[PDB]
A = this chain, B = another copy of it.
Amino acid sequence: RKFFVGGNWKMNGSKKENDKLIEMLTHAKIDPNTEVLVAPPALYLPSVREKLDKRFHVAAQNCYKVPSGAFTGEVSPAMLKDVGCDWVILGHSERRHILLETDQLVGEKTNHAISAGVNVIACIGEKLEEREAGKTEEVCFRQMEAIRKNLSSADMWNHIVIAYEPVWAKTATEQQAQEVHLAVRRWMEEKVSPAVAKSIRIIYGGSVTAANCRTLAKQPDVDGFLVGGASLKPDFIEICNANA
């Protein structure tokens, strides 16, 4: 499985700061076997995609579940493709828990994006009370099932990267991350197919820093990262190189 590192800029960006990050990525020494993605705020997606070499993916941080219509404030996968973007992050913990997105909506968006030619980083993860009640697997499997049930065909998994976010984190160890990634992969093996489970990337979306990335990368079922704050700093390059 090809190592996959996505930098989620979250609600951070400006012409000035984006220029700095683009120059950092353009001149950086990055392991050629790492797939690298960045996700700027929607306003800046067309410009970042125009300015970055195709070696880098550029992802939206959200999209909706139909190509057009009366949905003020929403953007569709067709618009992403229009501006050269072929990736989207869906179901991020902030969208589920702050902006109130349901499991079903994330699954509907995922199916629609892939149908429109956009690959999906599909995010899952449990909150603190859920982990403490022993429901990590119950919650993660429920979120995964809502995606599985909404896909139009089993080949769509070739266009998904699963991101596990330990929302509950209190600090998640590399052992705790590996434990969930393994459980999710075994779920994929049973509910989809061994072939998909073996090939699908499951990336870790907890706190990823220059200091902990190499230990996390060595876990056998951790295939990369969905990076938060470090994506805005030169440490992102070290994280991109965590598997090398």
- Check A12 against B46 for contact (C-beta < 8 Å): no
- Check B42 against A78 for contact (C-beta < 8 Å): no
- Check B68 against A72 for contact (C-beta < 8 Å): no
Shortest Cβ gap from A228 to chain B (Å):
7
A99 interface contact, C-beta 8 A:
yes
A181 interface contact, C-beta 8 A:
no
Provide the residues of chain B in CB contact with A11, threshold 8 Å: 64, 66, 68-72, 74-76
Identical chains bound together, number:
2
CB-CB nearest in chain B for A79: B43
The complex places the Cα of A72 from the Cα of B68 at a distance, in Å, of 22
Q: Which of A65-89 contact B (CB under 8 A)?
A: 66, 68-76, 78-80, 82-83, 89
A41 interface contact, C-beta 8 A:
yes
CB-CB nearest in chain B for A228: B70
The complex places the Cα of A62 from the Cα of B71 at a distance, in Å, of 11
A-B contact pairs, 28 of them (CB 8 A): A10-B71, A11-B71, A11-B74, A11-B75, A11-B76, A12-B68, A12-B69, A14-B78, A14-B82, A15-B46, A41-B74, A42-B42, A43-B45, A43-B79, A46-B46, A62-B73, A70-B94, A70-B228, A71-B94, A71-B99, A72-B89, A72-B94, A72-B95, A73-B92, A73-B94, A74-B99, A99-B99, A99-B100
